[PDB]
Amino acid sequence: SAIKKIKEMFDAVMPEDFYDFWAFCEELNPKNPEDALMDTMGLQLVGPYDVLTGKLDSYHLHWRYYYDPPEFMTVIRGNEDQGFHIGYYRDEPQALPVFVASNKAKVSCEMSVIGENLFSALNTCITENLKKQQSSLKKMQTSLITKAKELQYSLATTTPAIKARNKKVNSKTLHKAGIVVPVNAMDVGYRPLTVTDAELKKMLKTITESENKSAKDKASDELQELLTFVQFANDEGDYGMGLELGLDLFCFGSKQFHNTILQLLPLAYQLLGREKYAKIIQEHLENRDREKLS
Structure with a gap:
């Protein structure tokens, strides 16, 4: 419904996992869907998600951290000491994103690919928080996995399409x-x-x-x-x-x-x-x- 909103405020079309992820976080937290991940992993939806939350009414710089190239558009913020955040990487302004990536902006310029979509992206974060409260997190892990199954979002960190694009990369950078x-x-x-x-x-x-x-x-x-x-x-x-x-x-x-x-x-x-x-x-x-x- 706010596809048209985001098309004019940002100059972008978001993939369907963007909207499906939002709805997944309404289920979790109807009041503040952007904050559904906070109590458990310290992650808050930002950037394009802010228009849905109301906080926004160019926006190219909205939650663009220091090492976000123009192809990177942040949608989730995390550890503030690391500058940890998660965005869509998009080779072509007119194309859909080619994967989701994380960056620790206060650590390094380097991008970590954590899948094609925000469900696989979140899936990686849940694994790590659980690796190093937890009883509540495991039940989110379960709902994510089944919801991703339903909508057939791969939870793979590197998919065949991601590997296929890597054979077309001119330079890693x-x-x-x-x-x-x-x-x-x-x-x-x-x-x-x-x-x-x-x-x-x-x-x-x-x-x-x-x-x-x-x-x-x-x-x-x-x-x-x-x-x-x-x-x-x-x-x-x-x-x-x-x-x-x-x-x-x-x-x-x-x-x-x-x-x-x-x-x-x-x-x-x-x-x-x-x-x-x-x-x-x-x-x-x-x-x-x-x-x-x-």
């Missing part, structure tokens, strides 16, 4: 969740970075944490050489390279690179027909550390 861009019959559309990911981090750490000066100038020159390679790539149609490098600089997290990122990712997303993600990366870096709550 620093976040390890992968980019997917077209490649035509002449192999145009993507080319790799000329450094490994480990060399890339060593380079960027030198640029940002170093006193040697010549080493910083050297690494700054390597990075400038990368930007020139990206330049040839874009001229030659291999737009995935700039996307990879931009996302990688975003993932490193140094606010020093926001300007380079803004040379890479807005251009990359427009060249790829992913214009909405050019919007989000600009809005996000405009003010990246803040109160996330709206």
